[PDB]
Amino acid sequence: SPALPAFLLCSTLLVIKMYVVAIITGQVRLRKKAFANPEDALRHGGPQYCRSDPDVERCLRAHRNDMETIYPFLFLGFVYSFLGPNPFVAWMHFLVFLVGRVAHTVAYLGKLRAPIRSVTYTLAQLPCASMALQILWEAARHFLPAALRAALLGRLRTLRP
Amino acid sequence: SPALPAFLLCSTLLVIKMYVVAIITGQVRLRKKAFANPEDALRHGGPQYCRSDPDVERCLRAHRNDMETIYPFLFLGFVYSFLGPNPFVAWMHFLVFLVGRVAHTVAYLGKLRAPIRSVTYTLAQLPCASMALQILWEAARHFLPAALRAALLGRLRTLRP
Amino acid sequence: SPALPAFLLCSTLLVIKMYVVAIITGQVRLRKKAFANPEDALRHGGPQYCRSDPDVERCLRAHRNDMETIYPFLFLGFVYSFLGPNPFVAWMHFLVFLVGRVAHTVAYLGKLRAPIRSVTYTLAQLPCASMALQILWEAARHFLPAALRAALLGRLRTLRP
Ligand SMILES: Cn1c(Nc2c(Cl)ccc(CNC(=O)C(C)(C)C)c2Cl)nc2cc(C(=O)NCC(F)(F)F)c(OCC(C)(C)O)cc21
Ligand SMILES: Cn1c(Nc2c(Cl)ccc(CNC(=O)C(C)(C)C)c2Cl)nc2cc(C(=O)NCC(F)(F)F)c(OCC(C)(C)O)cc21
Ligand SMILES: Cn1c(Nc2c(Cl)ccc(CNC(=O)C(C)(C)C)c2Cl)nc2cc(C(=O)NCC(F)(F)F)c(OCC(C)(C)O)cc21
Ligand SMILES: N[C@@H](CCC(=O)N[C@@H](CS)C(=O)NCC(=O)O)C(=O)O
Ligand SMILES: N[C@@H](CCC(=O)N[C@@H](CS)C(=O)NCC(=O)O)C(=O)O
Ligand SMILES: N[C@@H](CCC(=O)N[C@@H](CS)C(=O)NCC(=O)O)C(=O)O
Numbered sequence: 500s501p502a503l504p505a506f507l508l509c510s511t512l513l514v515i516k517m518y519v520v521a522i523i524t525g526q527v528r529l530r531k532k533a534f535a536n537p538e539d540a541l542r543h544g545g546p547q548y549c550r551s552d553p554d555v556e557r558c559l560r561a562h563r564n565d566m567e568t569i570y571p572f573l574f575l576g577f578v579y580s581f582l583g584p585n586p587f588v589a590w591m592h593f594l595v596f597l598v599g600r601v602a603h604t605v606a607y608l609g610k611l612r613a614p615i616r617s618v619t620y621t622l623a624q625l626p627c628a629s630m631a632l633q634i635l636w637e638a639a640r641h642f643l644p645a646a647l648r649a650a651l652l653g654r655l656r657t658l659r660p
Numbered sequence: 661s662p663a664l665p666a667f668l669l670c671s672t673l674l675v676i677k678m679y680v681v682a683i684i685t686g687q688v689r690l691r692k693k694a695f696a697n698p699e700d701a702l703r704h705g706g707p708q709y710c711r712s713d714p715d716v717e718r719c720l721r722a723h724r725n726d727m728e729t730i731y732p733f734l735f736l737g738f739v740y741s742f743l744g745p746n747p748f749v750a751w752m753h754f755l756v757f758l759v760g761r762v763a764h765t766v767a768y769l770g771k772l773r774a775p776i777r778s779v780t781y782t783l784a785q786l787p788c789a790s791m792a793l794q795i796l797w798e799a800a801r802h803f804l805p806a807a808l809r810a811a812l813l814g815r816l817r818t819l820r821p
Numbered sequence: 822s823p824a825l826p827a828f829l830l831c832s833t834l835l836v837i838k839m840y841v842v843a844i845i846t847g848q849v850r851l852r853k854k855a856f857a858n859p860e861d862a863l864r865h866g867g868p869q870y871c872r873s874d875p876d877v878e879r880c881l882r883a884h885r886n887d888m889e890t891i892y893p894f895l896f897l898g899f900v901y902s903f904l905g906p907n908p909f910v911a912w913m914h915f916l917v918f919l920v921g922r923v924a925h926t927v928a929y930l931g932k933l934r935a936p937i938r939s940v941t942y943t944l945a946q947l948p949c950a951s952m953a954l955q956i957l958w959e960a961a962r963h964f965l966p967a968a969l970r971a972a973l974l975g976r977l978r979t980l981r982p
Contacts, residue, residue: 507900508960511953514893518946518953521889535882542935560696566727566888567682571675573896574734578668613703624679631672631679638669721857727888728843732836735895739829774864785840792833792840799830 502580502589509593510573513600517565520604524558531555561607564620565600572596572627579630582637592626599623663741663750670754671734674761678726681765685719692716722768725781726761733757733788740791743798753787760784824902824911831915832895835922839887842926846880853877883929886942887922894918894949901952904959914948921945 527533533552534540540549576596580589599622606616640648646656688694694713695701701710737757741750760783767777801809807817849855855874856862862871898918902911921944928938962970968978 504960504963507956508964510896511900511956511960514897515953515957517889517893518950536879536932536935538932538935539939557697562889566892567678567723570727570731570892571678574671575675578672610697610699613697613699617700628679631676634668634672635676638665638672641665642669718858728839728884731888731892732839735832736836739833771858771860774858774860778861789840792837795829795833796837799826799833802826803830 500580500583501586502584505586505590505593506576506580509597510576513565513569513572513597516601516604517562517569520558520562520565520608523608524555524562527552527554527558557607557610561604564603564607568603568620568623568627569600575627575630575634578634582633584633592630595626596623661741661744662747663745666747666751666754667737667741670758671737674726674730674733674758677762677765678723678730681719681723681726681769684769685716685723688713688715688719718768718771722765725764725768729764729781729784729788730761736788736791736795739795743794745794753791756787757784822902822905823908824906827908827912827915828898828902831919832898835887835891835894835919838923838926839884839891842880842884842887842930845930846877846884849874849876849880879929879932883926886925886929890925890942890945890949891922897949897952897956900956904955906955914952917948918945 528535529543531552531554532540532544532548533550533555534543534548537546537549540546576593579592584592599619602619603616603623605611606619649655689696690704692713692715693701693705693709694711694716695704695709698707698710701707737754740753745753760780763780764777764784766772767780810816850857851865853874853876854862854866854870855872855877856865856870859868859871862868898915901914906914921941924941925938925945927933928941971977
């Protein structure tokens, strides 16, 4: 599986990128003084700082969207890299996703004009869809009758004794 | 691992189902005109459409609940299928979960009467619990003293030189 | 991979712990009578019980934070245990995380004084960062030129025919 290291690289970078969104999120909570919890606010000013803020809310939306897209890629990308895909093709799947999700986060936290984020979400979903269909195709091919699987490899049953 | 393809099928369908919840969610945002972001709203009417809506909120709750149930199944189901379970039994685990989570989403987005969703959540959690205990049992059996592991396979230590 | 069973143990316990947060969450919804859905509230009193509550909100924050930390550990910890790390070192990575995340949840649901939770989140992130860098290092070492990889193993190219 020559694809696997490329996948390990792109997926681990994406986790780290997610960890970074987390760090940005806490820093925004500190600067804006907007804590989710009473106990936090007490330690950083008083109860009035237990409140929401638009920038904190945005950071969480970005993080949640990562959870809805990157966690599936971790699973799909893994299984897919054990399916002997073309190595260049697999690199492309992984690079369209990494660059797309990195761009996604920049478009969210940078608040760029619509629909720039919305497009980067869709483009990044493209290789994920592709890997999913391919995995489904291979899983489904496993359960075909053996007579059909043989016919597809050029072998009809012999009537000869 | 004859169980693995069945698992790949059920788990990949579940990811796709999650992708579909995502698509429904965006479509509800468009129709109701309820965007999470100022920049989105500007592109689709004006700032007044940066607002929440009950149907959008529901879609997100459904999606989040998928994240809390399906992502663990992706991990548990994978490891479990490498534990040589009975193939029919493993199919049942995977089918009770797939059908249960599909039913769950129908009960949420369809807004069926309580407690229909709540039941489908619980029934679907059943095979997940089962796989988890089994994985824990196998992981734990690995760390037993060797003398106890041998005794359980009928072998007591010999006093003979 | 002697590390793998230790990982299976710590990771499956963490999933179960997450399932427990889920159960606590529903029980808090019942006692406080704070349901996310109109249909739920009808079955447990009336529409006035379709409302938020501070304790329900906290439970969800705890659960979400698990999703942002434990799901990556499931992926990182798996890959890492196939990297032949020292078995004791790997046990430490897995135990600092398990104990840290268990402590995290106690600090959230128990509402302990700031910044006790915030510290336990950070300490638990430590072995995750470590595993990630190590995975990145191994994935990156794979793509170095072969001449550099050989030099690092003591082999320069021979000019001899
Ligand atoms: C006041 N305080 C907070 N406050 C806080 C609170 Cl109460 C609520 C929310 C945030 C925002 N969070 C963040 O910015 C993260 C970096 C944790 C993601 C923060 Cl920063 N977090 C801490 C976190 C730590 C911390 O994690 N220290 C590093 C250690 F864990 F290794 F000890 C810490 O260590 C202090 C000491 C004396 C123990 O070194 C103090 C901390
Ligand atoms: C106006 N607009 C939006 N608006 C939008 C905004 Cl700003 C906010 C929220 C939503 C709801 N999202 C959805 O319904 C999803 C399908 C993306 C999940 C939407 Cl639909 N999303 C787009 C998304 C795309 C898009 O994804 N196009 C397909 C492409 F990515 F391949 F280019 C797009 O392409 C236009 C063009 C000219 C580039 O083809 C336009 C788009
Ligand atoms: C009234 N009710 C509810 N209500 C409800 C509603 Cl409508 C909304 C939110 C909650 C809180 N959820 C929880 O506490 C969970 C344990 C499900 C996490 C609850 Cl408890 N959930 C149920 C859940 C079940 C349930 O899961 N039963 C066990 C079964 F699935 F195996 F049938 C159930 O079974 C009743 C019967 C007659 C079918 O046994 C009834 C239930
Ligand atoms: N959970 C998403 C489902 C749809 C989705 O993923 N949309 C993309 C493209 S518009 C996105 O960037 N969503 C922003 C978000 O989740 O905050 C939502 O609420 O929008
Ligand atoms: N995060 C869940 C934890 C409990 C749970 O998963 N409950 C099931 C059965 S009542 C459910 O369908 N929850 C609906 C949801 O998460 O919106 C919640 O807030 O209810
Ligand atoms: N999503 C997190 C990102 C930062 C984070 O994980 N912080 C840790 C340490 S302060 C935490 O316990 N967060 C509490 C939470 O997510 O409710 C947030 O909103 O704070």
